[PDB]
Amino acid sequence: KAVTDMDINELRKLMIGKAIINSSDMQGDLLQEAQDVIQSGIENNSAPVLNIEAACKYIKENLDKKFGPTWQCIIGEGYAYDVTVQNNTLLFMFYNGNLAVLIFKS
Amino acid sequence: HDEEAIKQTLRNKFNYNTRECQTINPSIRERGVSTEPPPSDTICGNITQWE
Numbered sequence A: 001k002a003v004t005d006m007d008i009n010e011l012r013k014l015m016i017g018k019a020i021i022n023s024s025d026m027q028g029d030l031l032q033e034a035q036d037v038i039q040s041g042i043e044n045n046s047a048p049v050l051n052i053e054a055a056c057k058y059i060k061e062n063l064d065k066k067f068g069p070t071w072q073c074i075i076g077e078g079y080a081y082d083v084t085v086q087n088n089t090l091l092f093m094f095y096n097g098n099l100a101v102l103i104f105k106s
Numbered sequence B: 001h002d003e004e005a006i007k008q009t010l011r012n013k014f015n016y017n018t019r020e021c022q023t024i025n026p027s028i029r030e031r032g033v034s035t036e037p038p039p040s041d042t043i044c045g046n047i048t049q050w051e
Helices: A008-014 A028-046 A052-066 B003-010
Strands: A019-024 A071-076 A079-086 A090-095 A099-105 B040-047
Touching: A019 A028, A019 B040, A028 A052, A028 A090, A028 A099, A052 A071, A071 A079, A079 A099, A090 B040, A099 B040
Parallel strands: none
Antiparallel strands: A019 A090, A071 A099, A079 B040, A090 A099
């Protein structure tokens, strides 16, 4: 039982609300506001089949009003990127399963 | 008394009073201010299903 009983397919099915943060470069108080908004927005726009474009459009509009005029966030199953951002303007957190989310302020 | 003397005589300390008035002016100063935005750094992140 426990970890041995658990399987990758089983783990994904068992928990869909688990939140994992891989890279943090933004102030913690700012991260708390951003994390609550992104999780709520993705679930609302997830629909029958998750849309990468749909999730980004909702996140981009919310972030621009929330902090600064030019805010760019990209979410993909797998990607390699080099990004130049302002100090404490980049937060990296990936959702449980094959979902990687990158949000930064330019 | 001459007419010119009478004209001078007509003016009196009580008859004519002269007051000097000036307006306070702040001293002009020259100052240089330089603004430069927060340092920005390049970040590269690679995400994989296993990671």
